[PDB]
Symmetry: C2
Subunit: 392 residues, 2 copies
């Protein structure tokens, strides 16, 4: 009776917790400044327990005089992975990021068709501590992918790296087709835009940031001025009490593998999988589902609702871990897909058949290398056990 | 290189696997017979590995002469938990089930407003083996909830219990408001409908079922005739090689707790949570989010897309387990919600405050009992440690 009450009440409270802990970047139109406004919350993990909240308030205004796109209300969804370079002696941060736009049922965008080089430069002043950061890398709006390496050019960074992430190129967000007209960021290019923020760290000081985001030649440049005030000396920021990265995250190798796998489905390379492409892939493997069935298949994983599957969605589908029995069975059926004649052994010809039909061109020697990598008993083919050890 | 190819190819194949392993019940309109047609797949787990597929083909026709509702294409989503009665010596099956309709952006329904008693009777003949099953329980279309106990009245059941589940009252499916007009099952009441199926077990025999589903007085009765043929003597069915239930499932106590918790949000008791009700709950706890923010909160968990949160959705949200740090932090913040004055101790007055504001009326002695259940050091209040042990 008492335990039932405690448990149910706890369930309700935690439910309210999960429902109102959204970390999305919320974007509205700022029609007076002819740009946009944004607001969101960042939750940093504190060493040995706790969370440091950072309230982001944001405004963006066009640099040029050309017409821009003023969006209806929508949001950006962001995934971030922070990592270190073992061969680096300088205070630094390796950053991988995926940003995709949702929330709804130009010339500048043409500048973001392929991979674009990125230069980031920041000069900061937190409680009198001057510092500088230089970063560089690549952005691919197609997949909404960002990959950069930042370095503190003034020695040791006086603030934790995660506090600078949101400050250190939203023009590389992937906007689905039905939302192409709501992309302010790309529409402001090549002239670019000014992005200003106030970031309030709960029970601590705040950042004020002003940034110029524009094309300089072929390079997307983000030049930043940051000013931090009212920070406590032994707070989570100046005291460096924030964790660098999260656990339970996919390694960049996992993400790479999933990226190539996704590339197998994504035929035109527009960064998303349609029913036509999935149907093509399945038809190549001998399965012929109908259009209705294909749409029914897409809808199950189409989280942001656009009738297709982008790369973060594919990532979510393939990172979702079920029961161990589910995994085992998934592997068994996969083996079923590889073993065409159902004779219990995957031959080189069958592996090559599956991979070629998937879209991957590979030679005799490569297929042979794969077989050799898997062939434990050395009989020239891959049985179920070997396949499982290869898949686990 | 080889491992990269193996891994990515495996990822693609498994992706195709997950995308095309949908277990939903797919419903279309059968305009000639003035009823419906349905098709779906059931995956049974085989002992020591493997899956037994069961292809369900279904047709339903009205019994009465009154007009019925012929739906546009949609589907039913089903969750099933099979359990045993320890105090039962007869061959039996305890069944808990949740069915909710989705897939789209009458007088009979009035018969399903509250809890309705259910009687099930089946006579079967599989490979010459006659048998009978009598089941009884309750259905609540509001939550799409079914709870029954079935018993083999002829001794030992010659087929595995899980093979009879789909055969052993889809009129208790929860149809969201925007889909009320697509509910054929309830519209055919009280006269009811005939439901016929052919269920093909891959590499084995098949079932042919004919059922009468109708009201007899106040009781919803499902009378079934089943005929099984072409089964292999040592197959998964006659050989009883199918597993009874899945692991990694919520116990009926967990489901009960989550049910009461859900009841706290569900103010009008219509089986779903709206933005108004969530806003009411949060306002009672001192938080005042806006309408836009409330909708933004709902949309994050609104899987089947109806602008609200039904009980299976709430179940999915609260059964989704994140990192251990996420759990710990969720508990910490929950404690924050309980501890109003932030003094580090949850008092009886505060617990009562939270619970009363949530909607639960409870007395001094009950709150005292809860405190006493949690109060480890016996100081009359609950600190963070005690709260955590209570929540874990
Ligand atoms: Ca594509
Ligand atoms: Ca999508
Ligand atoms: Ca073979
Ligand atoms: Ca071998
Ligand atoms: Ca309600
Ligand atoms: Ca819903
Ligand atoms: Ca207190
Ligand atoms: Ca105590």
């Amino acid at each position: 009776s008492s335990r039932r009450k405690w448990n149910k009440t706890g369930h309700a409270v935690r439910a309210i917790g999960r429902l109102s802990s959204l970390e999305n970047v919320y974007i509205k139109a700022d029609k007076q400044k002819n740009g946009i406004k944004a607001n969101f919350k960042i939750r940093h993990n504190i060493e040995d327990g706790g969370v440091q909240l950072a309230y982001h308030y944001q405004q963006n205004t066009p640099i040029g005089d050309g017409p821009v796109l003023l969006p209806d209300n929508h949001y950006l969804s962001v995934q971030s992975k922070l990592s270190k370079d073992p061969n680096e002696k300088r205070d630094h941060m390796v950053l991988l990021e995926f940003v995709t736009a949702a929330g709804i049922t130009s010339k500048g965008e043409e500048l973001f068709t392929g991979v674009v080089p990125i230069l980031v430069e920041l000069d900061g002043d937190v409680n009198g501590h001057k510092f500088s950061v230089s970063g560089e890398g690549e952005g691919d709006a197609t997949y909404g992918k960002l990959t950069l390496k930042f370095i503190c050019t003034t020695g040791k960074l006086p603030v934790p790296w995660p506090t600078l992430v949101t400050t250190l190129v939203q023009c590389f967000s992937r906007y689905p087709d039905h939302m192409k007209q709501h992309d302010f960021f790309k529409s402001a290019m090549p002239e670019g835009y000014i992005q200003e923020r106030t970031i309030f760290f709960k029970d601590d000081g705040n950042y004020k940031t002003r940034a110029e985001v524009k094309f300089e030649g072929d390079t997307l440049v983000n030049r930043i001025e940051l000013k931090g005030i009212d920070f406590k000396e032994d707070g989570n920021i100046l005291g460096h009490k924030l964790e660098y990265n999260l656990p339970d995250q996919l390694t960049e190798e996992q993400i790479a593998e999933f990226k190539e796998a996704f590339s197998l489905f994504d035929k035109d390379g527009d960064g998303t999988i349609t029913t036509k492409e999935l149907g093509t892939v399945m038809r190549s493997l001998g399965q012929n589902p109908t259009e209705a069935e294909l749409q029914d298949m897409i809808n199950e994983v189409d989280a942001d609702g656009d009738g297709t599957i982008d790369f973060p969605e594919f990532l979510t589908m393939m990172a979702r871990k079920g029961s161990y029995r589910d995994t085992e069975e998934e592997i068994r059926e996969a083996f079923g897909v590889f073993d065409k004649d159902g004779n219990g052994y995957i031959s080189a010809a069958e592996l090559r058949h599956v991979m070629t039909n998937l879209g991957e061109k590979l030679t005799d020697e490569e297929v042979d290398e794969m077989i050799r990598e898997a062939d434990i008993d050395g009989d020239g083919q891959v049985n179920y056990e070997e396949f499982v050890q290869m898949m686990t």
